């Protein structure tokens, strides 16, 4: 699919959104649900 040739991405511990299993942007996306500036 458009997110990757084999699919099977990780899913967020707070919402419906997806990232690559070792992506650094996931840590910022989670810290944003935890309310960090
Ligand atoms: Zn999320």
UniProtKB/Swiss-Prot annotation:
It is found in: Nucleus; Cytoplasm, Cytosol. Zn(2+) 10 binds at residues 12, 15, 29, 33. Isoform 1 is strongly expressed in placenta, spleen, kidney, testis and peripheral blood leukocytes. Expressed in CD4+ and CD8+ T-cells, CD19+ B-cells and CB14+ monocytes. Isoform 3 is strongly expressed in placenta, ovary, tonsil, CD19+ B-cells and CD14+ monocytes. A zinc finger (C2H2-type) spans 10-33. May be involved in transcriptional regulation. Overexpression causes down-regulation of a number of genes involved in the immune response. Some genes are also up-regulated. This is Zinc finger protein ZFAT. It comes from Homo sapiens. The gene is ZFAT. The chain holds residues 878 to 907 of 1243 of the full protein.
């Amino acid at each position: 699919g458009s997110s990757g040739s084999s699919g099977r991405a990780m899913k967020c511990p707070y919402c419906d959104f997806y990232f690559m299993k070792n992506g650094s942007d996931l840590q910022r996306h989670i810290w944003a649900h935890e309310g960090v500036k």
